[PDB]
Amino acid sequence: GSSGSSGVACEICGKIFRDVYHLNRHKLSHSGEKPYSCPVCGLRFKRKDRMSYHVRSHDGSVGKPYICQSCGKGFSRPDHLNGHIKQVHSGPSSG
Ligand SMILES: [Zn+2]
Ligand SMILES: [Zn+2]
Ligand SMILES: [Zn+2]
């Protein structure tokens, strides 16, 4: 480095500016999530082949209202979940 001067630091990319004015015009040039950016992370991609594997990779969704406490699948109704917990899960050494 060897460059520890007094200035500002962009809170988007991390670029340093000798003054604030030069940074004022930069913030305006910055893009707002595009063309293909992640709604979760925030990164920006210039391809649909990447963002597609990036977004899905996270899988942001719940689906059903109630979900198991183990496999966390999801059932339309509550009673349906009660039967699963006892069907698949719930099975101690004793009985
Ligand atoms: Zn910036
Ligand atoms: Zn992401
Ligand atoms: Zn389960």
Curated annotation (Swiss-Prot):
Segments forming C2H2-type zinc fingers: 8-30, 36-58, 66-89
Subcellular location: Nucleus
Tissue expr: Ubiquitous.
Disease listed for this protein: A chromosomal aberration involving PATZ1 is associated with small round cell sarcoma. Translocation t(1;22)(p36.1;q12) with EWSR1.
Assembly and interaction partners: Homodimer. Interacts with RNF4. Interacts (via C-terminus) with TP53; this interaction inhibits TP53 ability to activate transcription.
Function: Transcriptional regulator that plays a role in many biological processes such as embryogenesis, senescence, T-cell development or neurogenesis. Interacts with the TP53 protein to control genes that are important in proliferation and in the DNA-damage response. Mechanistically, the interaction inhibits the DNA binding and transcriptional activity of TP53/p53. Part of the transcriptional network modulating regulatory T-cell development and controls the generation of the regulatory T-cell pool under homeostatic conditions.
Family stated for the protein in its record: Belongs to the krueppel C2H2-type zinc-finger protein family.
Annotated protein name in UniProt: POZ-, AT hook-, and zinc finger-containing protein 1
Species name: Homo sapiens (Human)
Lineage: Eukaryota, Metazoa, Chordata, Craniata, Vertebrata
Stretch of the intact protein here: 355 to 436 of 687
